[PDB]
Amino acid sequence: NLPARICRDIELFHFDIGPFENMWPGIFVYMIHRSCGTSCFELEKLCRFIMSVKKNYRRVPYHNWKHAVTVAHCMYAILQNNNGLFTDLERKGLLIACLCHDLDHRGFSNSYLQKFDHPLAALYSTSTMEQHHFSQTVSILQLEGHNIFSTLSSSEYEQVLEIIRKAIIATDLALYFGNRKQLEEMYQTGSLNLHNQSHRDRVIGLMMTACDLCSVTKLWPVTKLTANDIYAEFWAEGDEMKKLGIQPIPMMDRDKRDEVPQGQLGFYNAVAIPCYTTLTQILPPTEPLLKACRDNLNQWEKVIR
Ligand SMILES: c1ccc2nc(COc3ccc(-c4n[nH]cc4-c4ccncc4)cc3)ccc2c1
Ligand SMILES: [Mg+2]
Ligand SMILES: [Zn+2]
């Protein structure tokens, strides 16, 4: 059962899930129980599922099991602070989607898989890794005793899997730019309609981006340390690009590491700030994410000065 400090602090947008890996499954179950009810899933099935998901995350620097639970926590915080907006099915689906959204990640981008001519790029030409993450999700659900959705009707099963698929695919950051552009237009013209499924899907897409990127919404010590892990992957990919005979983009080139503060500035400006700004416009209770993002932006500016 959850420690008093965790029960309190888990409700903060900037909660960090800690270094104790064995505690993370219980943290996830607690979040499920609080958003979805303790009758939502059979506990044994749920526990079995979570442990098989863990097993299919790799020991990479950033796109790992810790990332999965962290993304799920951010989703929990959004859902908790936006009571009555999302359906029981959406809430279950979105939390499970976040837990599964990077399944079997190798620590390489879609672009690298394409340049490598990896068999996954042949199977899934666009959003390669994300299509794979969804495939892994389905495969796990299909294992004996793992169908946490077995109490749903056939129709609800299909429905939740579609919610999950859309949510996982939305974590392809390539898609964020177009999605955010559409949403911002809908906001400003007052045409955003949460009862319109296509609009609803976009909002959920943006939520998935917000959650995926949430390391930039933590307090500075957490954010600064996390940046070490993301670049560890990117620089390794840069090395691999060099080995293919291809000059990596500066973000992936360890030789350009002194330029990290300027690169961060670019990212906050082009992606992070616009993301949380748009999210806050649609879901005002999510403002703490934007506040923390702006604070981290200032810290990078301070590093530069
Ligand atoms: C030289 C040196 C560094 C450079 N960096 C950049 C942009 O760097 C990033 C880093 C991470 C991410 C990111 N993508 N998805 C989640 C994250 C993330 C996760 C945790 N913390 C920060 C970002 C996006 C951009 C550009 C040019 C550069 C040139
Ligand atoms: Mg991903
Ligand atoms: Zn992710």
From Swiss-Prot:
Q: Which residues form the active site?
A: 63
Q: Where 3',5'-cyclic GMP is bound, by residue? A: 63, 264
Domain spans labelled PDEase: 1-305
* Triggers of expression: Up-regulated in brain after seizures. Up-regulated in the hippocampus one hour after induction of long-term potentiation.
Q: In which tissues does this protein get expressed?
A: Detected in striatum and testis (at protein level). Detected in whole brain, hippocampus, olfactory bulb, striatum neurons and testis.
Q: Which residues bind 3',5'-cyclic AMP?
A: 63, 264
Q: How does it assemble?
A: Homodimer.
| Role description | Plays a role in signal transduction by regulating the intracellular concentration of cyclic nucleotides. Can hydrolyze both cAMP and cGMP, but has higher affinity for cAMP and is more efficient with cAMP as substrate.
Q: Which family does it belong to?
A: Belongs to the cyclic nucleotide phosphodiesterase family.
Q: Quote the protein name from its UniProt record.
A: cAMP and cAMP-inhibited cGMP 3',5'-cyclic phosphodiesterase 10A
Q: Which residues of the full protein are shown?
A: 463 to 767 of 794
